[PDB]
């Protein structure tokens, strides 16, 4: 019953044109949100959304599909869940302490230069991260590990790009 | 007289800490816009507010210092210019058939995937992308360049990197 309740909610969302675009994203991520006021944030921005769809958007058509939507919503629900649970101190937002945890419990192994580079680039003054911020990176860094381990064919632990290539991966997220 | 009047700019949107965070980026691009109304935007929000000084911010003090704010001043001053001027049919947008050329005078010569993911990525259902989507765009693409070449240092074109380096790379962007 639950693939029916979700491809019922695929159908709903994605609309005439059956897939789900950044506006359409963006309209459902707020209602998760506002369904949930434990969770702070100044909410998605189309921004936010347009970055999460591209990064998800596979067979670049632009938009997201059934099957790309799915692997992107089931991720949004388990993050969801430890960001609410790894919010020890109840402030609604993942404060640096709480951080390696949160990512370690998504199945990120990352040493101390990272987050010091995720908290920087996503964390407020006080190193907190609201959860819109905490739900856009994780999709992120999601999404470069595993095109890092697809570009890593030799398993070497090295990738090597051309600038198309590059452009591609970089500006295409 | 102007030299003069760019450090007044700055010391006065850095401040106490010497420095031009995001918000103080996003407050006085913002001031832009408002002050150039044939320039069409939704405004520069925190979220590519954050990204762009992330790009910029070569020394990962997680703000921009005199010189990183005056390079990337300096370049939106350009594109500003190459907007106004690429926008042929004064729709205060860049359209499809607009692109290439705006682009070509900021000094980039791409091919038609690339431009074909740029728009799909950055412009609207039409085709047309607004101020700040340009400019973004546009820091984003020039940081990149930047970076792959700072990475090919044989210049056989194409560059080696492992995991960590990838994440800093694509992560703190
Ligand atoms: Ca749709
Ligand atoms: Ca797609
Ligand atoms: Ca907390
Ligand atoms: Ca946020
Ligand atoms: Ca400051
Ligand atoms: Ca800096
Ligand atoms: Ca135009
Ligand atoms: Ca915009």
Redesign the interface.
């Known amino acids: 019953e639950e693939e029916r309740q979700f491809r019922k909610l695929f159908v709903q969302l994605a609309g005439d044109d059956m897939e789900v675009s950044a506006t359409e994203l963006m309209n459902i991520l707020n209602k998760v949100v506002t369904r949930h006021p434990d969770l702070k944030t100044?909410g998605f921005?189309?921004?936010?959304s347009?970055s999460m769809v591209?990064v998800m958007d596979s067979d670049?058509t632009?938009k997201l599909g059934f099957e790309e939507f799915k692997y992107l919503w089931n991720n949004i629900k388990k993050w969801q869940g430890i960001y609410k649970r790894f919010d020890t101190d109840r402030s609604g937002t993942i404060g640096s302490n709480e951080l390696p945890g949160a990512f370690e419990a998504a199945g990120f192994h990352?040493?101390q230069?990272?987050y010091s580079?995720?908290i920087?680039?996503?964390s407020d003054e006080t190193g907190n991260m609201d959860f819109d911020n905490f739900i856009?990176?994780l999709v992120?860094?999601d999404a470069?590990?595993r095109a890092?381990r697809s570009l890593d064919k030799n398993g070497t632990?090295?990738?090597?790009?051309?600038?198309?290539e590059?452009?591609?991966?970089?500006?295409?997220?």
Chains 1, 2 share one sequence.
């Open positions: 100044d921005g189309i921004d936010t347009r591209a670049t632009g990352l040493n230069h990272i580079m995720i920087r680039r996503y856009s990176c992120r860094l470069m590990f890092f632990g090295q990738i090597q790009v051309n600038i198309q590059w452009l591609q991966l970089t500006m295409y997220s």
